[PDB]
């Protein structure tokens, strides 16, 4: 049904946000965000932060956050 998350019912009967399905959080007792989504985990040519967002590692010392994780500001490298 349509409900407060506007999106898919997990098999326990709770309504869940499909915007949460790919987020790596099981938001429900059953079925619970386990179903597939594309997260390529690119070659190390691209850095990948912590959330897995592939970004070109050449920007890991640019002075501009490449991902919301902000891991490209890592002091060890920059």
């Amino acid at each position: 049904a349509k409900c407060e998350p506007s999106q898919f019912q997990c098999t326990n009967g709770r309504c869940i946000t499909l915007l949460w399905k790919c987020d790596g959080d099981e938001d429900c007792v059953d079925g619970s965000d386990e179903k597939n989504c594309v997260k390529k985990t690119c070659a190390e040519s691209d850095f990948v932060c912590n959330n897995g967002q592939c970004v070109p590692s050449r920007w890991k010392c640019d002075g501009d956050p490449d991902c919301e994780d902000g891991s490209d500001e890592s002091p060890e490298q920059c």
């Binding site: 099981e26 956050p65 919301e68 902000g70």
Partner: protein, 306 residues
């Protein structure tokens, strides 16, 4: 020093930005605004009061208190703002009007920010609007946020922080959750692992009675330093107030210059006067009859008129 969820961040989605504008005030007669946030300014990680640097909750799996120089804090609305002072959970800056106020750590690639959709207007004191206080003008009573950070406006309190579970603290090898505390951390765990269970562990530990992380939460005894009463953290099971902190920048009575538009050229006629008026900015002309009736009149005059 804590974490907080704000409506808007450097990235247009809402985020758990370490800096989170918890409150704003604007009763200044100079356009300065008091801002309360989730980070502390003018203090070291240890809590010493080195004014050159500010601290906040580390935005990572292992939460500690990190530090940076206040020079990287930018406050903005429609444009950047002159910071008048900073102390603890609060900042004072003069900003042009705008529908929103934004606090941003401009640490290059560690750029993160918090914005509140709170309006600010170029208010003024006296009876004649001004873009900037002139000098050929009367000094009038007004109130402004005293730039001396040692002045206290009042106080708002804080409590011992409540739990803050970290998904990174648990691992599900063997099909039963393992608590994997960071090195040397006196992690405290609780879980309805088939049944209600709790304990403290300073090292890797194997739980029993449950097979998914959904039931297990793990955190640490970080009560060692208090956290503001704001909503972004759940309260400790005992949230009784832990002392108080003085809100900096006392609103203080002072004096402010205001313009005096060119003296109105009065014209006299039978039982009536014509005021010739010339004002560049809104001028509150007000008059009253000294009779039994007051005949109260007030009009925001603008431009040349009569």
């Amino acid at each position: 020093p804590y974490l907080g969820f704000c409506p808007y961040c450097r990235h247009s989605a809402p985020c758990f930005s370490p800096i989170k504008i918890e409150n704003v005030w604007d009763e200044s007669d100079d356009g300065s605004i008091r801002i309360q946030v989730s980070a502390q300014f003018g203090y070291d990680q240890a809590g010493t009061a080195d004014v050159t640097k500010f601290r906040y909750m580390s935005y990572d799996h292992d939460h500690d208190i990190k530090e940076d120089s206040v020079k990287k804090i930018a406050i903005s609305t429609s444009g950047p703002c002159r910071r008048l002072g900073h102390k603890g959970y609060f900042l004072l800056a003069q900003c042009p009007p705008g529908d929103s106020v934004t606090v941003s750590i401009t640490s290059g690639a560690s750029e993160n920010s918090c914005t509140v959709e709170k309006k600010i207007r170029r208010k003024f004191v006296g009876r004649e609007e001004y873009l900037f206080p002139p000098v050929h003008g009367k000094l009038v009573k007004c109130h402004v946020y005293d730039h001396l950070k040692e002045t206290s406006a009042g106080y708002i309190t804080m409590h011992r922080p409540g739990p803050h579970a970290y998904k990174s603290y648990l691992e599900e090898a063997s099909g039963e959750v393992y608590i994997k505390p960071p090195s040397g951390k006196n992690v405290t765990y609780e879980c309805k692992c088939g049944d209600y269970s709790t304990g403290i562990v300073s090292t890797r530990t194997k739980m029993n009675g449950c097979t998914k992380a959904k039931q297990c939460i793990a955190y640490k005894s970080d009560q060692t330093k208090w956290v503001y009463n704001s909503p972004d953290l759940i309260r400790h099971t005992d949230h009784s107030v832990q002392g108080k902190l003085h809100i900096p920048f006392r609103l203080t009575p002072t004096f402010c210059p205001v313009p005096l538009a060119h003296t109105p050229t009065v014209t006299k006629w039978f039982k009536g006067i014509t005021l010739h008026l010339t004002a560049t900015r809104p001028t509150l002309l007000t008059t009253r009859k000294l009779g039994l009736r007051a005949d109260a009149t007030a009009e925001w005059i603008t431009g040349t008129t009569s």
